[PDB]
Structure formats: C-alpha cells, structure tokens
Amino acid sequence: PGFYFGELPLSLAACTNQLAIVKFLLQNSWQPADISARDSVGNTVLHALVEVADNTVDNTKFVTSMYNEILILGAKLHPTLKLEEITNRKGLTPLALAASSGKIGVLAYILQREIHEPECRHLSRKFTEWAYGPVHSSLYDLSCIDTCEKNSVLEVIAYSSSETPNRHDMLLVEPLNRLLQDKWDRFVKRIFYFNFFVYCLYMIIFTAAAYYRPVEGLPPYKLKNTVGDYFRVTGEILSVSGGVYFFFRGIQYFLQRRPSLKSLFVDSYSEILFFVQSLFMLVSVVLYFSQRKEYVASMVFSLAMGWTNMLYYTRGFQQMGIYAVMIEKMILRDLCRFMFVYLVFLFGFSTAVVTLIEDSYNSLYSTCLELFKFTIGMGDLEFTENYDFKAVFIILLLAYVILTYILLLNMLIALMGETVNKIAQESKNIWKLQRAITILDTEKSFLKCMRKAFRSGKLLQVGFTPDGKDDYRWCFRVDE
Amino acid sequence: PGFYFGELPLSLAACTNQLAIVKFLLQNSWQPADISARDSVGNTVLHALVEVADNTVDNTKFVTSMYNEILILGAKLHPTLKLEEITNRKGLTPLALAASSGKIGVLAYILQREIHEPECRHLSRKFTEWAYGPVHSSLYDLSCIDTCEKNSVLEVIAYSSSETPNRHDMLLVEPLNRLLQDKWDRFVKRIFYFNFFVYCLYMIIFTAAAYYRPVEGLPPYKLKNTVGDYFRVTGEILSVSGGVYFFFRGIQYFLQRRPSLKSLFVDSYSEILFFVQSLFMLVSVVLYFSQRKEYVASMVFSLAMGWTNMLYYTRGFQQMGIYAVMIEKMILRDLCRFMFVYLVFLFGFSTAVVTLIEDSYNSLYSTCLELFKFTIGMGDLEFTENYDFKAVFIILLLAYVILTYILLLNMLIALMGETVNKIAQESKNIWKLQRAITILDTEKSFLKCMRKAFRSGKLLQVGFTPDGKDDYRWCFRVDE
Amino acid sequence: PGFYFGELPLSLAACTNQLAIVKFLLQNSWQPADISARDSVGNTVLHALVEVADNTVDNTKFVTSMYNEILILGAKLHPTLKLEEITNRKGLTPLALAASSGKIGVLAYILQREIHEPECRHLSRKFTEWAYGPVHSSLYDLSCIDTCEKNSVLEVIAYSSSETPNRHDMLLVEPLNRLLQDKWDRFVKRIFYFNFFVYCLYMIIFTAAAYYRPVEGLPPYKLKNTVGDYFRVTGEILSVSGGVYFFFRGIQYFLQRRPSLKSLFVDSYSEILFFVQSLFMLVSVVLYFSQRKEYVASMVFSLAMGWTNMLYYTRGFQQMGIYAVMIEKMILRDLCRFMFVYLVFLFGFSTAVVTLIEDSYNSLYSTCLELFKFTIGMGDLEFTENYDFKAVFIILLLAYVILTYILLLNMLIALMGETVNKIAQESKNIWKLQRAITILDTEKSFLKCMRKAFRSGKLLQVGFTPDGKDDYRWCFRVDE
Amino acid sequence: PGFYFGELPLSLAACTNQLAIVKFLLQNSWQPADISARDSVGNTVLHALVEVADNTVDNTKFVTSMYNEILILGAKLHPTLKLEEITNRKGLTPLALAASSGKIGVLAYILQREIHEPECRHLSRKFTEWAYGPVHSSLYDLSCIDTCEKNSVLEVIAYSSSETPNRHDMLLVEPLNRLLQDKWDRFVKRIFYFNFFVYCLYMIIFTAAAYYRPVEGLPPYKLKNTVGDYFRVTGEILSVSGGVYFFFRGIQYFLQRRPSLKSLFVDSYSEILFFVQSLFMLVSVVLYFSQRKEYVASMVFSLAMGWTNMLYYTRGFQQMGIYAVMIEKMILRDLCRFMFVYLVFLFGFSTAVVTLIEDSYNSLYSTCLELFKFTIGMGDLEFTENYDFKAVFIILLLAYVILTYILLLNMLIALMGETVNKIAQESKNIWKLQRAITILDTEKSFLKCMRKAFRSGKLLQVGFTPDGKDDYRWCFRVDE
Ligand SMILES: C=C(C)[C@]12C[C@@H](C)[C@@]34O[C@](Cc5ccccc5)(O[C@@H]1[C@@H]3C=C(COC(=O)Cc1ccc(O)c(OC)c1)C[C@]1(O)C(=O)C(C)=C[C@@H]41)O2
Numbered sequence A, B, C, D: 001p002g003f004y005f006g007e008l009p010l011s012l013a014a015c016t017n018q019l020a021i022v023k024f025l026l027q028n029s030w031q032p033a034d035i036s037a038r039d040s041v042g043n044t045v046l047h048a049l050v051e052v053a054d055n056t057v058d059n060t061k062f063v064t065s066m067y068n069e070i071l072i073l074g075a076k077l078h079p080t081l082k083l084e085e086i087t088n089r090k091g092l093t094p095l096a097l098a099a100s101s102g103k104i105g106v107l108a109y110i111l112q113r114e115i116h117e118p119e120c121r122h123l124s125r126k127f128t129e130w131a132y133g134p135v136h137s138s139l140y141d142l143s144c145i146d147t148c149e150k151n152s153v154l155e156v157i158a159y160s161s162s163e164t165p166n167r168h169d170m171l172l173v174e175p176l177n178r179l180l181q182d183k184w185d186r187f188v189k190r191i192f193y194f195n196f197f198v199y200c201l202y203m204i205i206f207t208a209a210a211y212y213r214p215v216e217g218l219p220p221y222k223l224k225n226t227v228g229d230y231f232r233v234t235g236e237i238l239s240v241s242g243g244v245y246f247f248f249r250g251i252q253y254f255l256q257r258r259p260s261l262k263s264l265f266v267d268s269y270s271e272i273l274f275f276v277q278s279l280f281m282l283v284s285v286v287l288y289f290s291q292r293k294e295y296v297a298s299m300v301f302s303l304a305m306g307w308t309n310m311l312y313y314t315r316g317f318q319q320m321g322i323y324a325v326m327i328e329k330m331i332l333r334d335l336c337r338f339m340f341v342y343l344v345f346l347f348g349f350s351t352a353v354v355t356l357i358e359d360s361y362n363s364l365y366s367t368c369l370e371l372f373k374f375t376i377g378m379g380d381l382e383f384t385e386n387y388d389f390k391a392v393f394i395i396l397l398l399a400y401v402i403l404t405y406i407l408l409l410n411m412l413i414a415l416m417g418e419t420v421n422k423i424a425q426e427s428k429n430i431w432k433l434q435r436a437i438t439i440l441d442t443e444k445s446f447l448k449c450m451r452k453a454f455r456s457g458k459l460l461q462v463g464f465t466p467d468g469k470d471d472y473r474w475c476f477r478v479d480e
C-alpha cells in the first residue's frame, strides 16, 4: 500500500486524468489548491505527473494535456510564484526529473510548449520571427541546459547510469540536437582534433622510446652525453608524463561521477581502459627505478593498450565510430558467452588427450596449445607417433575438430550476424551520445579559461513577462 | 465413417457453436441435461469442450463462452457435485486435458475466470484486494498446479513428449510464470547453484585422479602408504561413486518418465548424455578390475564427456542458456544432413584419388585423412610425387577443394545463419521450459525431507460457497 | 497485328468481361452461337478463356465467372456434345492449356467445380458423401490425370520446360497434392527405396572392383582361376552393366522429352549427370580393350561422379532433399558468376608475379598454383628468396591476399547468405516437383507389367447425367 | 533575411498552391502575368515550380496540377510563344532542371503529359495510335533526348555528380527505359562486345609480350632478325599503343566532364583506374628508354591492373554486373573502416612484441609480417625460442589472435552481410545507370561518322498545331 494521495489529492487526480477535482480545488472557500507546497518526500505535483508517464501515445496525450492545464492553472491562480523552478529532495526540476527518468514525451512538451494568450506568454518555449511557406525561423529561449549551476540537462542525460530506458533516444529532439551540432561545429571540433593529433604524437614518441630501450639488464641505465641518450630519456620523460596525466584524469572522472560498480564495466568503458593503461605505465616506472628487469614486461602492456585506445578517437567520425562501437559491444556482451563454451570444449578434449597418451606433448599446457591450434587452421592430426590406443586418440581429435572448428566457430559467425542485424540502428544513437559526452567534457575543461560558447544571445526575445520587467534567456534560433 | 454425435449432441452443438440446444436440454421435462454422468469412453462433456479448441480467436471465444455457460448451468442444476473434478479414463481433468493437448486459450480461461454473482462465486479464479491507478493487487486461488496428486499442471506440461503444439508456450501465462519465477527466487536457485558447484568439484577431482594414473601396465595397481596413493585412490573412489550415482539417477528418470524411443533422442537429451557418461565410467571400472590395460580408453571418453556435460548447467543463466540450447539444436537436427553430404563428397573423391595412384598414401584411410585436411586449412596439393596421370590427379583435387572447402562449408555457414535467424525467439521459451523441468525435479527430490514450499496460504479468502462451508485453496498474490 | 475480333467476337467479349454479347449470340434466330466449332488456328473459345488469364484476383474472378457462365450456356444449347474434350491444333484441352501455361487460378477452379442443379451437374468436380461439422468427406471424379492417353495433366506440368511461371506452385492444390501423396505412400515409396539400395550396392561393387585393379600395365589382364580374379572380373562386368544401363536410360529420357538445349542444363540436371557418368564408364571400357594404360584415367571420373550422384536420391527425404537442391542451385547459377571474378584476379596477379621474378616457381603454372593456395590457407608470403624488386613483389602479394582472401571470399559468403534467405521457400516446392517427377517415371516404367495403381474406383457416384447413362470416372475420396 | 517575394508573387502562389492569385494575375487589365520574362537570376516561373518539388505524393499532385494549369493558361493567353523552351542562366529547360535536380515526379509528368482539347493538343507528350483492350500503342514525340544541342536529358541524368537524390531512379520511367533498351538492342550491343573482344586481345598480347621480356639487364635490347624478336617488339608496340590510347581517352573524359575532385573518387571510378593503368604503362616506357632496369617494376603494375580492369566490361552482363558493382562498393566504402581498425591492432601488438623480445625477428617489419600471417591461417605461436618473459609474450600473442582472427574478421563478415542486404536493390539501378553511361559514350564516339540511330521517325502524328503547319519531332512508339 501507499501513494501520494495523502494530504495531496491533486497528484492522484492528475494520475487519474480526473481534472474536475483539479479545477475544483482552485479557490474553494473550504480549502484552496495549494499546488506550490512541496510534499513530505520533497517533490511537487509537477514531479508526480512526470512519474506517471510511459511514452506511449495515449499516456503521452493524457499526461501532456494534464500537465499543460495544471501549469496554466498554477500561473493564473498564483502569478507571484513559479512552479517549474521548485526542486525535489535531490534537486531535480520537472525538466530534470523527466530527463533523468527518460520521459521522452514530457521532455518533448517541456522544450516545445507555446502560449497564445496574454499575460502568460512567459510559459512558451518556441517563438517565431520569420514565416515563409517552405521554411520558418523559430526560436527557443531555453535556460538550464548549458549551465544550470545545479545540474544541466545534458549533464543529467549524458551521465545517467544506463538505467534510463531512453538513455540515448531523447537527444534526437531538435532543441538539443541542434545545440549539440552547433557546439560541435563552432569550437569543439577543433579542440577534439587537436587532442587527437596530440595523442597520436604521444604514442609515436612512446613507441620510439620503448623500442630503443637499452638492451643491457639491471636498470636504471647511465646516460651518455651523446644525442641518442638525450632523445631516449626525453622520450621516456614524455611517456611517463602522459601516463601520470591519464592517471589523474581517470581518477578525477571516477570521483566526479562515481558510478555504481556494476555500471562501471558496462559504461565508462573508455575511461577504465585509459586508466588501466596509466596503471601499467606507473607500475612500469616503479619497477624501472626498483632495479628490476621486469619493467619491460609491464611497459609493453601499456604500449599494447596505448595503440588500441586510439579507437577511442573514432568517435568524431560517424562513418567509422559506428564501426568502432561494435568491438566494445561484442567484447562486453558476446565474448564471455562464447569463451566459456570454447574453454569447456578445449579443456575437456585437452585433458582427455593428455591423460590418454603417456610414456614433449606430455604436459597439459602443450596439448592445450596444440588443440587451440585447430582454431587458427594449423592443426596437424598427427602430433604424436607410436602411442597406445591410436584409434581412440584419432576419434577424440576428429570429434574435437568437428565440434569446434566446423560448428562452434560457424555458430559464432551466425550469432554475430544476428546481433549485428539487431543493432543496426542502435549504434548510431550510441555514437551521438558518445559525441554528446565528448562535447560536455570539452566544454567543462576548456583548457584556457575561455567560456564564450553561449547560444544565439540574451536579447529581449519574449517581452511578455508577468511583471513589467524584461526577459533575458540566451535565446537560440532554428530555421524550420 | 462415424462421428461423436452418438448419445451426446452437445459435442455437435459445440462443434457448430449452437448454444440453444444447451439451454433446451438444460431442464426439459421430457429429459433434462445429465451433465454429471460420464461418457462411455470415460470422459465428460467438459473434456469434449477442451478437445474442440484450436487456440484461434473465434474458436477461443466460442469454446470459452460455451464452457462458461455449461459450468454455470451445472452449478445451478446440480449444486451438490463438482464437474471439473471428474476424471476421464486416463485420469485427466479438463484442466489437465487442456494442458496435455496444448490448448492455450482454454488454459488461459480456466486459471483466469471470474464471477460477479452470488451462490456461485466459488468458481472465480482471480480476486482483487487493492486497486490503485497504475497498479492493482490481484489474487489467484490456484490449486491442482503444484501437487494435484493425480496430474499436476506442471507435470503435464513439462513432461509432454514434444508432440504438444504449444509445448513451451503454455508456461508464459501469468499464473504459471509468476509461480515458477518465485519458486526459482525463493529456494530452488540456491539448491541449483550448490549442485553446480558440487559437480564442478566432481569433475576437477576426476580429472586430477585420471591424469595421475600410474603409468605401468596391468591393473590393478598396488597401493603404497605414501600420501600420493591415498589421494589417488580416494580420487578414484569419488570418481566411480559419481559415475554410479549418475547411472542410478538416469535409470530412475527413464523408468519414471518412460518416453517413446522416438522422443528419447529429441527430448531427454541431457539425461541420455549423462547416462552415457556413467556407462563409460562403469565400463572403465569393469575393465579396470578385469586386468585389462585398455580401461584407459573407456576412462577418457567419460572424462571427455564429463567436462562437456557442464553445459547442462548453463540452463540457469538465460543469456547463456539460449546459447547452449542453440548448440544442442544444431548438433541434433542439422548435423546429420551436412555430415551425409560431406561424407559423400569426401568418400567419392578419396576413393577416386586412391584408386588412381598406385605402385604411404596408398591406403584408403590415409587418403581419406589427407582430403579431410582440406577443410581445416592444411591441404598441400602435392602430397604425391612421380605418379602417373598427374593432370588427372590435380583436376580431381582441385575439383574437390572447390567443391567442399570453397562452397560446401560456405553453404553450411549460410544455412546456420538462416536457422539462427529463425530460432532467435524460440530459444527463450525453450530455456524457460528447461528451467521449469529443473524446478520440478528439484521439488521432487528435495534432498532432506524438506517440503515447506507452498503458496501464500490456505486462509479463508473467499467464503462465498453455495454451501456454508469455507475455502482453503493455498492462495497466491500477484502485484499487477 | 492479329487480334480476336476476326470472326470470333466471343473471345473479345471474354477479353472485355461483357456477358451480354455472349448471351445475345447464344441462340439468336439471326445466327446462334456456334461455340462447338473450332477456330482456324485449331483452338476453341474455352482455350481463349484460358489465354486471357493472368492469375490476379480480379482477373481470377472475371475469368472464373465468365467461364462458368459460358460453359453452362454451351451445355444448355448443345446437350448432345461435350466442350471441354475438344482439343486444339497441338492436342491440349482447356485443362491441359491452363496447366501448360501455368494458370493457377483457372487450374484451381477447373478441378474444384460444383453445381446444385439437375441435368447439368455432370460438369461438377467435387462431390460430398459424408457431412460432419468440422470435417466433410468429399470426392473427385477427376480423370485425365494419371493416364489420359493423349497428354496427362501431371505429364504436362512435370515436363514443362521451366517457362511456366507457376512451374511448381500449381501442384500444391488438393486434387493433385493428395493424389501424389497417396501414390507415394502406397507403392512408389517401396520401389524408390529399393532402387536406392540397389544403386548403393552398385557403387560399392564398382568401388571395390576399381580399387583392386591389377597394378601391372598393358590391359587387358589375363584371368587366373583363383577366386580373386573371379570376384574382380564379376565386379567389372557388373560395373560396365550398370554403365550401359544408365546410358540407355539417359538416351531414352532425351528422346522422349527432347528439351530445348537451353533448358537442357537448367533442367534435366540429374539425367545429364548420370549420362555423363555412363559416358566416362563406356569410354573406360573402350580404352580398356584398346590396350591403353590410361583407361583408369576415365574410370575414376566415373567413380568420382558415381558417389556424388548418390545425392540424387536425397529427393525422397524432404529434410535432406531440400539441402541437396540448394547445392544444385548454387553450383549451377552462382559458380560461373564467382569463378569469372576469381580467375581474373588470380590470373592478373599470377602473371604479374611470374613476369616480375625471372633469372622453380618460374612457370606460370606453379605460380598460378602458389597464389591459388592463399585461398585454402597455405600461402607463405616468402616462396622466393634473393630476387630483384622485392618491395614490389611483396606489395603485389599483399594486394592479392587482401583482395581475394580477405574481401572476395567473405563477400562470397555474404552473397550466399542473401541468396539462401531468398530461396528459403522456393526449394520446398522444387522438392515436391522433384518427387512428382520421380513418381511419374516410377509409374511409367513399373518394371513388371503391374499397373494396379488406379484411384478409389469407378463407382456410379453421381449418376445425374443429362442422358440416362451412368458415370464411371475412377473417383477419389478426400476427407476434408 | 531574404526571400523571392520581390516582383514575382507567382512563384509564391505556386509554392502555396493558391490558384486564385495566378488566375487573377493572368490577364488583368491593370497588369497581366508576364510569365515569359526571366527573373533576375535568369530563370522563369516554370523553373520555380520545379524548384519547390519534393517527390512526395501530395507535393507531386500539387505541383503537377498547378504546372498543367499554368501551361494551359500560357497556351490560351500567349499562343505566339512557347514557355517550356525558355532557358535559365545556365541553359536548363524545366525538364532539364527537373532532371538535374532529381525531380522524379515532375520529370515523370512532363514527359508524359496529355491533352484532350483542340487548339492546344500540340503541347502533349503522349499520343495514342492503336487502342486494343489489353494493349495499346502510344507514341512520344520527345525532343532534347538524343541530341538537344545544348544538353540532352540523358546527359543531365548520366553525368550528375552523384549528389542528386534520385541519381538512377529517373531512368526507370518508360520513355527513357524503353529507349535505352532499344538502343542497346539495336546497334550498341555489337559495338560494346566488339570493344570487349578487342580489349581481351590487347591484354593477351600485353601479357605475352611482357612475360617474354629479355632477361639480360640494361635496356633497350638490340633486336635480332629472328622471328621471336619481331613478335616481341610488335607486342611491345601494341602494348604501348594501347597505353597511350587510354591516356588520351581518359584525359578527354576528364576535360569534358570535369568532376569536383571529391566525386572524382566517388564516381568516374572506372576512368581513373584505366587512366592509372596508362600512367604506369607510360612511366614504364619512359624508364625503358632511360636505360634503367626498374621499368619492369612499373610494367607489371599495369599488367596487374590491366587484367583486373576487365571487370569494367562486366557491365553489359546484368547477372554479373550486379556482382562487380558490389565489389566496387565494398572497396570504396568498407575497406577504409576495416583497414584502420586492423592496422591499429596489427601495429599495436607488433610493436609490443618487437620491443619485448630483443637480444631475425628483431625488425618491426618481420614481426609485422608474422602477426599479419595469423589472418591467413599460417601463424605458429612459437616463432621465437629461449627469450625472456615468455609468459608475457604468449599472453600478448593469444590476445592478438583472439582479437583479430577470431573476432574482427568474423565481425567483418557479418558487417558485409548487413551492407550487402541493404544494397540488394540499389545495385540493379546502379547497373542500369552504368549501362546508360556506356550507351551515351558509345553514341558520342560512334567510331566511323555513323549517326543513323534516331527514334521511330518524323511522322505527322499530332497535326494539332495552332498554326496550320505539321509536327516533325522524331516520334517513338511504345506498345503498352
Ligand atoms: C547424442 C549423442 C549420443 C552424442 C554422444 C557423443 C558421441 C557426442 O557426439 C554425438 C555426435 C557427435 C559426434 C562428433 C561430433 C559432434 C557430435 O553428440 C553427442 C555427444 C555430444 C557432445 C557435445 O555435446 C553438447 O552439445 C553439450 C551439451 C549441450 C547442451 C546440453 O543440454 C547438454 O546436455 C548435457 C550437453 C560431446 C561428446 O559427448 C563427446 O565428448 C564425444 C567424444 C563425442 C560427443 O553423439
């Protein structure tokens, strides 16, 4: 049991689409409609009527009409008090809550509503200046999207923990899509490409420095005044510098976002991979000054990861990022599934073969390798000669080949085909979301105290305030 | 010739959906309706009502309406006796018959009917306790589902011999789905995982014991007081103990179910595989004490099967269970086809090549192998030098390679693509059924004389019987 | 030029769906309708009504209704003579013309007529004997199907030259489907399986005889009285006997059907393959007695073909026959398409590599082979050492490998996938047609002067002729 | 700001679909509608009403109806001058603009428009001569298709820079499709096949000449009077002649068309490939007379390209052209995506392995090769023995193999599958366009001052001029 009816029937009325109670509570001498007071849980009716939504057509029309009517009534009953600005216990506005919960219909309303009545046109979002046949030039005077100073809308959407059912669908709406596209086109694109080029130089320097490590053992290695040593040690210093930089940026990301440790591996994939690179790099430098030879064994892993992480920058090239996301999705969702099956078969037949033949392929490891080799097309079928029960041996090997090489790999290919069909359209939206989070971090860091990235301007766009004062809302024009 | 009209026109009325005869026969002074007496073949009219169904929309409405009307009239005319409780020649109730024959519409009715009338409301199934806007709390008086003591519904569905057209679709209805989900969530899950862990330890012990068999010939091998021999012989005793355990459980499964020996290989797949493992294990121990060297040959097959059978426990993880099911389907129904085609090609070209070249690759076996190799990417195209008719030889080999390696394997990949596409959604229902049968065996065995797994309780929820007595039905709540 | 207005307005009326002209021309005192007289090209109006059909819904209803009306009127005006039995210049009845042209709508009508009037219901096809609610037991008096003694319907459909747009679709209609199914179930199945077993013994004997050919040269080989020679020569005699038998079978097929030499390779596939086997076998006999050693070079090509032709008998096992059909389709229509491209690439890069490197891989043949090997996963990339322009060499080889191994073969796999998707349903109908042809030849040959394979009997089922005589039509009962 | 209201509201009526304004402006005594005068940008209202089109159903009907009305009014008010003939600043007619911009609806109308009114029927396109029930014989009097003397519509469609949304759909309309089919059937097909055969002889001669280059160094090589040298030098002269011919033809293509240097690789693929062949050929002859041995390194590339370019002639065989075009698409669109990913992985693990193991495989090149080999199924997993950190080495190699061989290549196969499915239909229209461009170039060149390839003739089929004169328009008959 339990609901928000208690001490607040308006919430239940709006949930129930029974607007008569809502209009009845307005100004009754028995008891007026106190929409403006917050409930015990901290939220308001404007948040409750957001909770009802489920994005379906009938629910969309119900909740949209209910919200618009309730908002107009709030405006006319209490012109001295705004309702959309009142935050809940956590801090979310109805805009913020609808975004966080992934209520695409209510979002579509909140960023596109319009008024054709006097003394309340401050509630409209869309405004028109030029009106031609094929095309119109409308304007959005949205705030609380670029920098709301509590939680910007894009911060709420981009950093959701993948639990929002419309995690990446809502960003396709025009009032956000055009903003992201413009932010990309104006200044973010140059910063991002510059970062890409800087990283590529970083990996080239790291590869060159590592490849020319001095071959004698027992580090550290005394430097000579010759030029090769200045180049090498400079390359090393640049390499470790890059590593520690990534370490700090990774930890800053984690402390700011703090995902749930189950989302940590199914989101924030890129940050953990970069962080792990930096961890290997720092373990390497630690072992390097520790007078151990083993540091190279760590360095290469960073190197091996470093080049691979270059795929992170394929976001920013849609035609290629749409490919690059496939590896993330398959390595996360499909590799564990396949690898358990494959390791079961490999271990089963490998133990059978290795226990069968005993008196050079007498280890379990060597035979695990030899039966792995049938998956890369180098099995030989005669890796042992003059051994007992050879008929049984060959039956086992051919059973293995038929099982894994002929069937299981082909099952893998077919399943990847089906999954690729099932994510034909999803990957594009994932790419757009990846561009969005790229843009957000780009704006957040900004590298040089430069913040001149506002919308089309703070002009007196509306001029119909309920007070006699003037509006300033950083408006933004769209040629529809 | 012949029909079911004889001495029962009500079956014809249902076949034509002519309801007037029902009410006409109801209480006619010439002869009333004797609903309560059984037919000559043992069954009742309500069973005939079940047989007529075909799960389609119009047939569903016709059969549902006629069934409900007949039930109400049976209540009104003969309140002293129940009709659903009367069994047929085999023992099935209309519930049980509808389940066994796969009559999903009538099943959906029987467990979801409702009454809004006095003195017959005991016939209602669904009941309501709380009624909110978005959610309602309903209640079912499900009985004769968990343990009806003649034919439980789950017993009938789970153990159908795969001939029921809706074999796995019946379990999707709420009154069964929620029961299975709760039984899984409550206590079955821990028992199943415990079994899984126990089996994994079993296979580890078996592998370790077998790998370290003593290398000298002529078993049995005299034990030393050193610790290695105590460990090895203990491992052997545990291994053969597990084998005989599986033997007994397999034979118990067969005697309790007794499938039809055509269903035996397309259902009961897991049981026969475990049974075959145990047979190899027991043959191994028989040969072991028989002073035979070749017990190894029977050991390893069990070992090789043992690890493979671990995929049985992949039911229990849906995201992996469907994958293991796909492998089962491909090995069962698709392999025989391809293997016949492939063996025809391999044998044709192998016997042609071996008869061509004669004066080391002169056996049919060696050449069968050499041409098999072209599938796994290790054919050489020059495995013979200085032999007659080399042009003809090479034409044959290239014809073979073009035929099988280039085309037939690609035909296999494409066909697996179509089949995987065609069973993407069926496998989910197969997994759910494979969990249902697991749950049923879990309840049946219960390991420790613990049976406290009943539904929400036998409280006097309804109490609206035409007699003054009370209801005790092991209720069950659903948060709709 | 040329049209249907000339001296036959009835065909034009049919083209225009205007029955008024038909009834007016029917029995006018100025001139009645001479429907029964044949046109100058040999055909009648009933054949014209077939020509106008195009299998669409509206065309179906138009042609069906107008045909029925015209036929009833022809019966009423001229009860002394039948109209459907009058043949055209070639010999086809309207049933035969509709079948040969592939007019599925008219075919469905003509075999399923029904009349509820006296003195004309002799023209109906379907008759009812038992009438229950869900099932009825009807009968067809259909003749001119099994043996019409001029051109049976099944002969017309089965032996069409693949130009019929509904070549295999029309056999799904019940009056033919049930006939074929019963003919299969009754006696054909045993003959077919017997043939299959006989052929399998034939190939086993041939393989054994060929494998043990005497190894010395210069045939023929003098026989010894020892048992091995009696077995070998008996096997040889059986082998050649089988070859010549197939030779006669193939030539009889060609002379009876006489396809068009463009249909010859896209239909009659199985017959030409068996014929080619027999040709190689007879060539081997000729060379054998010609004191040539190279007879073996022909014998193996029979042997290699012989085993492969066993796939012909997969018709008769639907689940496997469909798969063999898919292989036939691919090897016919996709292999030329692919192999042109592949041979172009192989020849281009092979001649480039061979002209590049000159001073053991210096022949065009050896290099054609070496670059072929990259398809089967055995290319080495260093098959030449110490040769000029090695950079150019390696660029060419890697260009080749990237082109064919990585891209072309994967593209072949993808296109086979799409084609397989596009023929999922066609192949089933091809299988049914193949079984139909099997049945027809089985009935035609009949092996022992046994022809007791008629339909349900010539009983006087209808007996409502406009004359006082009785009906004898070899009826056939169907329990619908 | 800015809009085309100024001094021409007729275009605004057209884009607003308000016939009142255009009818009122038509012939008002205050001011008529001066349709015939060009606007400031050079175009007329007939072009404006094309500009607003968007090929949708409603837009199609609006623009079609209004265009027809405007033309009729032009006929009635201004019979002294035609309006469709007035060209814009560039020179396009309304049909030319509709085609160039890809306006399939208006393009379909404007070539098919018909009038059932006297004194203006001269403006119709379609005319009917024979009228049968199932068939009709219509005629098109279209001009400005074969030779417009400014720009034919086929030149407009064929040479669009791939940016037109209906690039290849416009050729599906009857007056163009039938015309192209007939042009192909009449005389073009023999010319094309003759060209194909000539080219095949050219490549055979080139291959033979190059293969038999004299093996001694230091070209040029003194000729002997023996026949082999006359054959070789003649082959060389023919080869270089072919090369220079292609050079001139390619540069003529570029200068006539002059694409945009971004479409230069998106279209004109075939021409640039042939041109590149000729460039390699000319570099080869330059180096040949330059007394350099390196000329062979250029020769082979031409040879290697030469054979490959034979796929250009696979247009002309539709059943194979659809395959060659898909190869072109994959090499252009999919190779860059995959090759970046693959090269990143190959380079990352190659540099990791090569820096790990140092003391023969110490080069980055050799290891880059060795890890490339794992794609073609010849990796060994033990290409180094007795090296430090072998556990780390093997972990890296197996990580590489699992990453690329097992996953990346299979994902490539699946992605090619989805892409080829998404272009199942587009390849057909691409082939038809590729034949259209062939036909147009064939007519342009014509090889021998032969131009007798007009339409069905200048018959006086219309004869409904507002003057008393006759129509001569090179008509063309279509038997619908
Ligand atoms: C059906 C039977 C009786 C079966 C028994 C043996 C002979 C088997 O080969 C087959 C046929 C075969 C032969 C060679 C290659 C593949 C398949 O499939 C199984 C049988 C099948 C397998 C593979 O089995 C599986 O798919 C695992 C599995 C998947 C899903 C399940 O629900 C499951 O139930 C326990 C088991 C492994 C073998 O037992 C094995 O290790 C050896 C040596 C042969 C395999 O015969």
Ligand SMILES: C=C(C)[C@]12C[C@@H](C)[C@@]34O[C@](Cc5ccccc5)(O[C@@H]1[C@@H]3C=C(COC(=O)Cc1ccc(O)c(OC)c1)C[C@]1(O)C(=O)C(C)=C[C@@H]41)O2
Binding pocket: B396, B399, B402, B403, C269, C270, C271, C273, C274, C276, C301, C304, C305, C308, C309, C311, C312, C324, C325, C327, C328, C331, C335
């Ligand atoms: C169509 C003809 C005349 C054909 C005859 C020979 C040369 C053939 O190669 C082909 C072309 C070819 C060549 C190399 C590889 C594949 C195909 O296909 C068959 C022909 C085809 C095959 C494969 O045939 C089949 O698909 C079996 C089959 C399937 C379905 C059937 O209905 C069927 O009817 C009997 C046979 C085997 C060969 O006869 C053979 O063993 C050799 C040495 C070459 C094969 O030419």
